[PDB]
């Protein structure tokens, strides 16, 4: 009943059981994934999180937690597809759990710039961020076919799907990501 569902991508898998859970690393007392979720909730009413470890911890802030299908597909696309299979509604705005400064015009600018394409993603002036992406429902069967073919490459898929980059180069540093606990330590 709203137009775009926001989605925090907190990562797959768990060949990572027993490793750092990056989305739960805290920045000024608040888990990174919640900084992303809170920024998406500024701009969208309905926001969910895709998480495959520590689900109970993710569930404690009261948002729906969506787990990957047993297919165990690789990479960020697998989370996107699991969310589309488990949520209704025609558009999704995905964002990884490690980019806590995303701006309040993310959804609005991606939508303004979509120009009829079924997918658009953020370019920050230096690089594409193809997991920060506004995706139409119609992508679901193409994603399923691509992952069932054993493919994983995110940019390749976005290109095959007819998407384009949207220029956010004027948003200084809104798209910086925390790659490691070492980097997080610097942003405190
Ligand atoms: Li653990």
Swiss-Prot record:
Localization (cell): Cytoplasm
Gene3D superfamilies xref list: Spore Coat Polysaccharide Biosynthesis Protein SpsA, Chain A
Induction section of the entry: Is expressed at very low levels under both aerobic and anaerobic growth conditions.
Result of changing residue 75 to L: Nearly no effect on catalytic activity
Cellular component terms (Gene Ontology): cytoplasm
Outcome (variant: residue 79 to L): Slight reduction in catalytic activity
Subunit structure of this chain's protein: Monomer. An equilibrium exists between a monomeric and oligomeric form of the enzyme, which could be an octamer; whether this oligomeric arrangement is of functional relevance is unclear. Interacts with MoeA and MobB in vivo.
Membership in a protein family: Belongs to the MobA family.
UniProt-recorded name of the protein: Molybdenum cofactor guanylyltransferase
Organism for this UniProt entry: Escherichia coli (strain K12)
